[PDB]
Design a protein around this ligand. Structure first.
Ligand code: HEM
Ligand code: HEM
Ligand SMILES: C[C@H](O)[C@H](O)[C@H]1CNc2nc(N)[nH]c(=O)c2N1
Ligand SMILES: C[C@H](O)[C@H](O)[C@H]1CNc2nc(N)[nH]c(=O)c2N1
Ligand SMILES: CCS/C(N)=N\c1ccccc1
Ligand SMILES: CCS/C(N)=N\c1ccccc1
Ligand SMILES: [Zn+2]
Lengths: 414, 416
């Protein structure tokens, strides 16, 4: 059936009919809901040593091709019919097929548009697509990645972009970017288990060292990239410092904040997810946009398993950390988020606060309701990590399901 | 690995498997196709009025399951007493179409219902519940007496005690016992000529129902509403709670001296009165239960929700913040001070309350307890994580499995 979706702040109601177009199962069942789980048990994306079932692939390919021609208002046209025949021909003889650049561009934008966990989707139509499918080495991957970064950064005036490397091929190894993001701060394990830097990057930091990287000893050492060409050991590449724009954090009124020596990079670029389009899989397709302040100020800096700076800022603010009821944690967190926004604005680097971002998502939901009869969204990820109910999305019911094209998680290459 | 949901805590990196979900006998709203976990009222549980007596076969199954749960809880499963109790229930349903619970069974079921509530973050307290048996109540007037006694016992002058009063169960083709109000304490919501609302917008409908039934309305922002109590097959009767029994707390701020001037306040006792308590197929349409507040309920939702008192702008203006731009984080700053005021005021008045940090930490302990005791704990992530400072609390980083277990507290249609 079609779910009734209500917004409790406004009392408005809609019905999601788009979910009926989903062809991939999620983790839930009538007996129990697993919507709060981060990763799949296996929904992932298993190996590719053998060719995907011709029937299945062809079914997905046709669907995508149909989606494409519908987007250009040329459905049923001569081109549409012949393109479909081309794909069938290629699959029947080779067990796979290839996308035309225009189809790739449309597919990438749709994958972003369909990502249920992305609150910035109102920007889905504005995405610069770099075709890197004519890449045959790790060195070439590095060149493409540097160009992506320079373009995406644009001196602080961030522009959303994605670079697409060669699709996966049967029996052959994948092109892969080992790092989870193009910019990551090192996490060094020492002495008594503690960690200097970012605890989230301990494993990747160690891998780089093992592969020849001369480690530093700071809290914010930008890591090198481990790029891997098919069936070859990954190679190490150091990003030119002038390409990695960073923002020193300072507070608008608290003079001592800057003394904390905190900072964060301007460009958020995901590099470990897989882009699936019409059955084809792109194991290396880094995409980037701009940060929403809470990602840095709340999660990256305040998570207990991350930089965990909450108590330090609290002590500097001379707050009463003796008890939970003083809400010192809440107070410290707000100022940290403020410092991030202030600093990025001062540095003239694009960023959006959680209020503005959620307000735009609500508009996006409305645009999509009229455009496709619904919009897949993951409530737990859409609602900000702080001030949840202070934002409109908290009061908005959502329907979560999987549509394709899609960005999916994939196994670590090591 | 194990054929059950793998649950992970991303803060500690620890893993568990939920085997308790295998015990669920009722389906939720989700399917492999789409997750509806964020819906407030998906139409499943929803105990819609089912007048004509229920299928004896249906009731019996639920009844046997509950009796098994009961005997299992006292470690006498498979015993003579167990088999005899089962026989009695089957015989009673066989001749009357329904059955009745022993005193100790009602106490066990009520506690289990709380224990099974996926949306309650205060379940670490589940074992300590005062169960008032009111299954002898036969009039709206007597319901009021029982309710007043509940309020007095539960309030205990500020040192709140969890409690539940159970009125007669639904009977074959007979009228239900019902408390029309959603809570025992509710502030009136008066629709204004210009279309706005004075008081609590959440209670507009009930406020009007009270007026329609003879209540003389006030014009304040915090007027305690009267109760509309309904005995079987009778029109609801209006009852005014004696002021001395409704403990309220004026709100003031620890450092911001002007906050007290705002004239804000909230009642001490959170008592849910419109939910249905289901035990072994038996349905208790009127069984008000109460505990104590978690500060965010008052400070964040009730006082700052756009559709509630909506005081964010007022307080922000008082703090002299830049309310003209989102990036000043004025909403966040005001909400924090409003929450601090709630905690400070309740502490000053010596009325029980728990902040969202302490409450969530205790819930984590509860999850650990339940993992060992039952192999899991059904939890609604969206309701467990607090409305403010979500990731600053431990529950945010804890994956959760949601499912329906009985005994349980379910939503039921409004009697009007
Ligand atoms: C234009 C600015 C954008 C903003 C402000 C934005 C913001 C967000 C936020 C806050 C998250 C969660 C991040 C986290 O908690 O780690 C998210 C997730 C996501 N976004 Fe966006 N986004 C933007 C651009 C993009 C772009 C350009 C793409 C791809 C073309 C994209 C794809 C996704 C995906 C796939 C996820 C989920 C990742 C996961 O499952 O871990 N976003 N976005
Ligand atoms: C001892 C103190 C307790 C605390 C701090 C606590 C806290 C909470 C909170 C924060 C909520 C969410 C309320 C909302 O958002 O409107 C909740 C939900 C719930 N609690 Fe507890 N609780 C406690 C006692 C009780 C008791 C005594 C019972 C029953 C015997 C109970 C049954 C429930 C139920 C059924 C819900 C969900 C109601 C719904 O779906 O609307 N709680 N609790
Ligand atoms: C366990 C829980 O699913 C997990 O902590 C989720 C919650 N919501 C989130 N939301 C966003 N945007 N990003 C995250 O990493 C998470 N983590
Ligand atoms: C739409 C969404 O389900 C709704 O706003 C929920 C979210 N989480 C909640 N959590 C609690 N504790 N209480 C609520 O009323 C809600 N409302
Ligand atoms: C695509 C960068 S858009 C962004 N603001 N952040 C993300 C960080 C990690 C994963 C996904 C999104
Ligand atoms: C049983 C009061 S326990 C409590 N703090 N709040 C609730 C408010 C509304 C519904 C359920 C719980
Ligand atoms: Zn679900």
């Amino acid at each position: 059936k079609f779910p009734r979706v209500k917004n409790w702040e406004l009392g408005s109601i809609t019905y999601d009919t788009l979910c009926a177009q989903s062809q991939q199962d999620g983790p839930c069942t009538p007996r129990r809901c697993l919507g709060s789980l981060v990763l799949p048990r296996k929904l992932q994306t298993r190996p590719s040593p053998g060719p995907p079932p011709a029937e299945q692939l062809l079914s997905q390919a046709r669907d995508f091709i149909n989606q494409y021609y519908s987007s250009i208002k040329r459905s049923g046209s001569q081109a549409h019919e012949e393109r479909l025949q081309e794909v069938e021909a290629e699959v029947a003889s080779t067990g796979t097929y290839h996308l035309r650049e225009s189809e790739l561009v449309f597919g990438a934008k749709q994958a972003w548009r369909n990502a249920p966990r992305c609150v910035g989707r109102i920007q889905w139509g504005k995405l610069q697509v770099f075709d890197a499918r004519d890449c045959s080495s790790a060195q070439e991957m590095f060149t493409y990645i540097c160009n992506h970064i320079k373009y995406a950064t644009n001196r602080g005036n961030l522009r959303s972009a994605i670079t697409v490397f060669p699709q996966r091929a049967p029996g052959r190894g994948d092109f892969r970017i080992w790092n989870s993001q193009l910019v990551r701060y090192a996490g060094y394990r020492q002495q008594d288990g503690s960690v200097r830097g970012d605890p989230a990057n301990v494993e990747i930091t160690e891998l780089c060292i093992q592969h020849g990287w001369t480690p530093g000893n700071g809290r914010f050492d930008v890591l090198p990239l481990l790029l891997q060409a098919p069936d070859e050991a990954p190679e190490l590449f150091v990003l030119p410092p002038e390409l990695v724009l960073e923002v020193p954090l300072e507070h608008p009124t608290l003079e001592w904040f800057a003394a904390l020596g905190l900072r964060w990079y301007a460009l958020p670029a995901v590099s470990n997810m897989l882009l699936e389009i019409g059955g084809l899989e792109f194991s290396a397709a880094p995409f980037s946009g701009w940060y929403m302040s809470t990602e840095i100020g709340t999660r990256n800096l305040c998570d207990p398993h991350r930089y965990n700076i909450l108590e330090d800022v609290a002590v500097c603010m001379d707050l009463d950390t003796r008890t939970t009821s003083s809400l010192w944690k809440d107070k410290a967190a707000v100022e940290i988020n403020l410092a991030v926004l202030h600093s990025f604005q001062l540095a003239k680097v694009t960023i959006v606060d959680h209020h503005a971002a959620t307000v735009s998502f609500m508009k996006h939901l409305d645009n999509e309701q009229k455009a496709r009869g619904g919009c897949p969204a993951d409530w737990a990820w859409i609602v900000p990590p702080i001030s949840g109910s202070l934002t409109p999305v908290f009061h908005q019911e959502m329907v979560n399901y999987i549509l394709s094209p899609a960005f999916r998680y994939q196994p670590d290459p090591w």
